[PDB]
Amino acid sequence: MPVKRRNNGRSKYNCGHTNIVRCQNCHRCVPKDKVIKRFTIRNIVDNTIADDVLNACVIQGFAIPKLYNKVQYCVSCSIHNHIVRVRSREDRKIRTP
Amino acid sequence: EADVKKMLVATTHLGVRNIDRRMQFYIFDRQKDGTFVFNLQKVWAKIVFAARILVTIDDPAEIAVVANRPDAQRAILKFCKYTHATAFPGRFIPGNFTNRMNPNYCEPRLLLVNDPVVDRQAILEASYVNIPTISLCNSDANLKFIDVAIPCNNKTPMSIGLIYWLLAREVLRLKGSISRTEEWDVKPDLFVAL
Amino acid sequence: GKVRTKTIKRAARKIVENNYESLKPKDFQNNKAICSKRNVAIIPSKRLRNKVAGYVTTLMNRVVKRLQEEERERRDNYAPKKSEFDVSGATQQMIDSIGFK
Amino acid sequence: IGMKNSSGVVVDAYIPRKCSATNRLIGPKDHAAVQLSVARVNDKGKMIENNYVTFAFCGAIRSRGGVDSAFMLLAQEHGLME
Amino acid sequence: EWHPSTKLGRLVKAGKIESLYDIFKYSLPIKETEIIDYFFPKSELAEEVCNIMSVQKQTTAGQRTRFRAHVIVGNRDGFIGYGAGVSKEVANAIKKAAKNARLNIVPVRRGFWGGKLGDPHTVSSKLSGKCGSVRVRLIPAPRGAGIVASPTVAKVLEFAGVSDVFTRQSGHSRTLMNSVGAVYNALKSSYSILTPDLWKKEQLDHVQDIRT
RNA sequence: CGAAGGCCGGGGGCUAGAAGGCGAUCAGACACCACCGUAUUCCCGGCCGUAAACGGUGCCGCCCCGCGGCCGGCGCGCGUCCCGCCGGCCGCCCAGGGAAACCGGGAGGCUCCGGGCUCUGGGGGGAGUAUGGCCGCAAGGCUGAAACUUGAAGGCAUUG
RNA sequence: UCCAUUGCGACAACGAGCGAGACCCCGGCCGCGGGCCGCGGGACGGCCCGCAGCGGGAGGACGGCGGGGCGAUAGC
Ligand SMILES: [K+]
Ligand SMILES: [K+]
Ligand SMILES: [K+]
Ligand SMILES: [K+]
Ligand SMILES: [K+]
Ligand SMILES: [K+]
Ligand SMILES: [K+]
Ligand SMILES: [K+]
Ligand SMILES: [K+]
Ligand SMILES: [K+]
Ligand SMILES: [K+]
Ligand SMILES: [K+]
Ligand SMILES: [K+]
Ligand SMILES: [K+]
Ligand SMILES: [K+]
Ligand SMILES: [K+]
Ligand SMILES: [K+]
Ligand SMILES: [K+]
Ligand SMILES: [K+]
Ligand SMILES: [K+]
Ligand SMILES: [K+]
Ligand SMILES: [K+]
Ligand SMILES: [K+]
Ligand SMILES: [K+]
Ligand SMILES: [K+]
Ligand SMILES: [K+]
Ligand SMILES: [K+]
Ligand SMILES: [K+]
Ligand SMILES: [K+]
Ligand SMILES: [K+]
Ligand SMILES: [K+]
Ligand SMILES: [K+]
Ligand SMILES: [K+]
Ligand SMILES: [K+]
Ligand SMILES: [K+]
Ligand SMILES: [K+]
Ligand SMILES: [K+]
Ligand SMILES: [K+]
Ligand SMILES: [K+]
Ligand SMILES: [K+]
Ligand SMILES: [K+]
Ligand SMILES: [K+]
Ligand SMILES: [K+]
Ligand SMILES: [K+]
Ligand SMILES: [K+]
Ligand SMILES: [K+]
Ligand SMILES: [K+]
Ligand SMILES: [K+]
Ligand SMILES: [K+]
Ligand SMILES: [K+]
Ligand SMILES: [K+]
Ligand SMILES: [K+]
Ligand SMILES: [K+]
Ligand SMILES: [K+]
Ligand SMILES: [K+]
Ligand SMILES: [K+]
Ligand SMILES: [K+]
Ligand SMILES: [Mg+2]
Ligand SMILES: [Mg+2]
Ligand SMILES: [Mg+2]
Ligand SMILES: [Mg+2]
Ligand SMILES: [Mg+2]
Ligand SMILES: [Mg+2]
Ligand SMILES: [Mg+2]
Ligand SMILES: [Mg+2]
Ligand SMILES: [Mg+2]
Ligand SMILES: [Mg+2]
Ligand SMILES: [Mg+2]
Ligand SMILES: [Mg+2]
Ligand SMILES: [Mg+2]
């Protein structure tokens, strides 16, 4: 077991301790700077009915509301559900989204 | 003064918003939007110095001219056409200076490159077989394994063509081939890429 | 599902480059053309010859859409009658700090 | 000169070249070393045959890019530039 | 006979180059072993096989075995060389090692401990070398002292022309290839150390340069 | 002074939840999964003194190729910007170093070895054990052997 | 991308070789010769549309020919 990453697998810079979050899939405790974080904006009605709601609406000029959700998962759940992948040694250095 | 006017039309005097410490001596001012400007007098003195380095070699076919950039390709086949240097136009194949079994292998005495980040393989390979090098260098250039820089704009076609045209003219002047203090029969347009 | 091996292709390229004038883009004439020993071609079998000719015929109708090296050279040497070089805030400061201006 | 015998004879096989910039000895198998020469016109803008100046640079000065300024400074001391 | 593949080897074939020290003075690589063999005709070089090692690559069906051979050459009078070679058969590995040993010849500088009477008889001054974990110290010694070194180091010091030397070795010197590499590197640095004997400035005259 | 768990005496008590109970699964399941739940989790006054208490990297001082990001203070310039300076937190990296991974604001300036100070180690087990001492309400903590046994244990890296 | 380390194209690698394929045997359709056997022609991703090659049509005896033979380096 040598060192695998320069950040030790987290984003902790000039502090001793950080907050705890609960994984939204399995509910384990994870430090906040380690948890995998994604933000999503979606429509409350699925796009496959997004025009039939609209055509059956009495209010003139209505606009379909949206949902704003920040999903946070642990390492195990992120790998299992394919939010992140295991990468090659060269590829691990890439930070591009 | 006429060549100064040509340098102004080609804009051979504008950098790329970043400056290296070793090119700091060639800078004159900074444009507000961040672009740097070269002192053209220093550019001409480097051109003359490079010319006075090129003519020490008796046979010019042992000078290598390497330029991978498309916008310079035409310009390097004409520099040879009037000086008789040896051009390596496209992708430089590893081994050309170190591997004797290659078909285009050679053993030159001067390497002349166009850009130091493009054409990096030629510069790195020349350091294994004792070749000095001269490079056209912009404001962000890294001068590792380079002996003579030439401050200039090395992206726009007019700049590149006019630069090789000036170099070939001063070499043909120094050797005595073409007359001194008289405009060369060759128009610089023959160097610029259409 | 019929991929030509390098052996077909490498012979087909020398055949098309050497015999550009003889090869129409239609196949029977090229089948004859991959037969002569004067356009010297030692094809040791007729199936092999047919495959090579099938790739040669295809190479023919790709150059339409040497005659394209004479003109490329004869257009790299043309100097027009113009010269292509016939506002500043910081370079002005540099021409004053050099010469006449 | 080199190392001497007790009587006064140099018992050295060969003398390495010295760097024109950093005075360091070149040494064999230092294949990044370069020697190169400059024209020294002196004659109405035209060169004179077989009358040059010649400097040498070890690989250490090249590996960091110090030569573009040091060569210029060396030239400004020999009346080849300004 | 042999036809040169390089301009230097083409130049040596005629009467252009007089000795090895001109090729070392302007430090150029040597790519043909008959360039070396032209300057040392027929057995002024001693060639001795230091080591043969069996190396194994693991494979789906079983182990693949090859051999690695380490060879040193010298002339007892100021030249040493060290090469290595890998092959399926031992004979070819040794052949490759001997060729590589001939292309790696370097000159060695000698001097005087104390009295400067005759020929230089020991290292010119303290030398140090590193290879792998091995480190070596060659210390100048008086006359009659001999070559005080391990039997691996003593052969390299014998081929090099060094009569009197003290030696210290640190690291895992049982690894024979790194031992010989460290001693070789120490001998190779001998002509790159500034001593007051060499301070005097000189003019370079391009007429003598072999023009790379 | 010192996370969490733990202890003594008071208070409080939503949630979650060692222990315990119960439904499944399974050859078995005293576990993983479901459900219910005591101490605990929170406040006050004390005790205990340990964590992968980690950057697995002691403290003070000097020199050190460069390219960037962010935070605090200040100064010059044009017409918010822009260039610097000091202090902090980060990324990449030439040389140099190293068994290498890697470090590079040091893990550099070191077999070419010496700026100052404090602590710790000397093959693997036995063993952090026995014994004695000090501290603690307890749980512990700190200090800490020998007989005897053994030819390797271990690091980083390559191919399958 | 292909049945395929079959190929395009890119590259601190450049250039070769083996295995693959090509090759051999058989059988479909047509000619010259002999008296059915024995010598050749024939098919090639060749034509036409749609996007190295994947699709859809057509003619033709046969449509991407079909069934076999051979069979790398290293080994148990
Ligand atoms: K480990
Ligand atoms: K570790
Ligand atoms: K972590
Ligand atoms: K922080
Ligand atoms: K924080
Ligand atoms: K994240
Ligand atoms: K996890
Ligand atoms: K190099
Ligand atoms: K405490
Ligand atoms: K605690
Ligand atoms: K408690
Ligand atoms: K409660
Ligand atoms: K409570
Ligand atoms: K508990
Ligand atoms: K339970
Ligand atoms: K259990
Ligand atoms: K279990
Ligand atoms: K419950
Ligand atoms: K408790
Ligand atoms: K409680
Ligand atoms: K808690
Ligand atoms: K509580
Ligand atoms: K506590
Ligand atoms: K520990
Ligand atoms: K840690
Ligand atoms: K300390
Ligand atoms: K800030
Ligand atoms: K700031
Ligand atoms: K701050
Ligand atoms: K600030
Ligand atoms: K600030
Ligand atoms: K600041
Ligand atoms: K600072
Ligand atoms: K600072
Ligand atoms: K700073
Ligand atoms: K810092
Ligand atoms: K201490
Ligand atoms: K300690
Ligand atoms: K300790
Ligand atoms: K300890
Ligand atoms: K006891
Ligand atoms: K007690
Ligand atoms: K008690
Ligand atoms: K108690
Ligand atoms: K007790
Ligand atoms: K007790
Ligand atoms: K105790
Ligand atoms: K181990
Ligand atoms: K260990
Ligand atoms: K271990
Ligand atoms: K360990
Ligand atoms: K290693
Ligand atoms: K190892
Ligand atoms: K490749
Ligand atoms: K017959
Ligand atoms: K017959
Ligand atoms: K055909
Ligand atoms: Mg306390
Ligand atoms: Mg509850
Ligand atoms: Mg409950
Ligand atoms: Mg502890
Ligand atoms: Mg700790
Ligand atoms: Mg610790
Ligand atoms: Mg920051
Ligand atoms: Mg930070
Ligand atoms: Mg940092
Ligand atoms: Mg100690
Ligand atoms: Mg006790
Ligand atoms: Mg006790
Ligand atoms: Mg290893």
mmCIF file of N, CA, C and O (backbone and C1' of nucleotides) and ligand atoms in Angstrom, chain A residues 6, chain F residues 68 89-92 104-105, ligand 66:
data_model
loop_
_atom_site.group_PDB
_atom_site.id
_atom_site.type_symbol
_atom_site.label_atom_id
_atom_site.label_comp_id
_atom_site.label_asym_id
_atom_site.label_seq_id
_atom_site.Cartn_x
_atom_site.Cartn_y
_atom_site.Cartn_z
ATOM 1 N N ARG A 6 -2.574 12.285 -4.794
ATOM 2 C CA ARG A 6 -1.976 13.406 -4.077
ATOM 3 C C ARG A 6 -2.961 14.071 -3.124
ATOM 4 O O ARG A 6 -2.549 14.617 -2.097
ATOM 5 P P G F 68 2.211 32.893 -16.353
ATOM 6 O "O5'" G F 68 1.532 32.217 -15.079
ATOM 7 C "C5'" G F 68 0.205 32.521 -14.696
ATOM 8 C "C4'" G F 68 -0.605 31.268 -14.478
ATOM 9 C "C3'" G F 68 -1.705 31.375 -13.435
ATOM 10 O "O3'" G F 68 -2.886 31.982 -13.931
ATOM 11 C "C1'" G F 68 -0.448 29.422 -13.036
ATOM 12 P P C F 89 0.439 28.065 4.842
ATOM 13 O "O5'" C F 89 -0.738 27.598 3.881
ATOM 14 C "C5'" C F 89 -2.056 27.439 4.380
ATOM 15 C "C4'" C F 89 -3.058 27.269 3.268
ATOM 16 C "C3'" C F 89 -2.769 26.182 2.251
ATOM 17 O "O3'" C F 89 -3.095 24.886 2.722
ATOM 18 C "C1'" C F 89 -3.483 28.146 1.146
ATOM 19 P P C F 90 -2.456 23.583 2.035
ATOM 20 O "O5'" C F 90 -3.024 23.617 0.550
ATOM 21 C "C5'" C F 90 -2.261 23.162 -0.555
ATOM 22 C "C4'" C F 90 -2.998 23.418 -1.840
ATOM 23 C "C3'" C F 90 -2.361 22.880 -3.106
ATOM 24 O "O3'" C F 90 -2.590 21.500 -3.297
ATOM 25 C "C1'" C F 90 -3.031 25.100 -3.467
ATOM 26 P P G F 91 -1.426 20.555 -3.856
ATOM 27 O "O5'" G F 91 -1.470 20.756 -5.435
ATOM 28 C "C5'" G F 91 -2.619 20.416 -6.194
ATOM 29 C "C4'" G F 91 -2.560 20.990 -7.589
ATOM 30 C "C3'" G F 91 -1.400 20.549 -8.471
ATOM 31 O "O3'" G F 91 -1.577 19.268 -9.047
ATOM 32 C "C1'" G F 91 -1.709 22.882 -8.666
ATOM 33 P P C F 92 -0.344 18.247 -9.151
ATOM 34 O "O5'" C F 92 0.559 18.814 -10.334
ATOM 35 C "C5'" C F 92 0.098 18.807 -11.676
ATOM 36 C "C4'" C F 92 0.925 19.700 -12.571
ATOM 37 C "C3'" C F 92 2.394 19.350 -12.737
ATOM 38 O "O3'" C F 92 2.620 18.263 -13.613
ATOM 39 C "C1'" C F 92 2.151 21.684 -12.483
ATOM 40 P P G F 104 6.303 18.294 -2.844
ATOM 41 O "O5'" G F 104 7.509 19.118 -3.474
ATOM 42 C "C5'" G F 104 8.600 19.574 -2.690
ATOM 43 C "C4'" G F 104 9.748 19.995 -3.571
ATOM 44 C "C3'" G F 104 9.438 21.124 -4.539
ATOM 45 O "O3'" G F 104 9.635 22.382 -3.918
ATOM 46 C "C1'" G F 104 10.528 19.339 -5.685
ATOM 47 P P G F 105 9.140 23.756 -4.584
ATOM 48 O "O5'" G F 105 9.000 24.733 -3.341
ATOM 49 C "C5'" G F 105 10.083 24.928 -2.435
ATOM 50 C "C4'" G F 105 9.603 25.343 -1.066
ATOM 51 C "C3'" G F 105 8.982 24.228 -0.226
ATOM 52 O "O3'" G F 105 9.221 24.493 1.156
ATOM 53 C "C1'" G F 105 7.383 25.914 -0.583
HETATM 54 MG MG MG H 66 1.153 23.441 -3.179
#
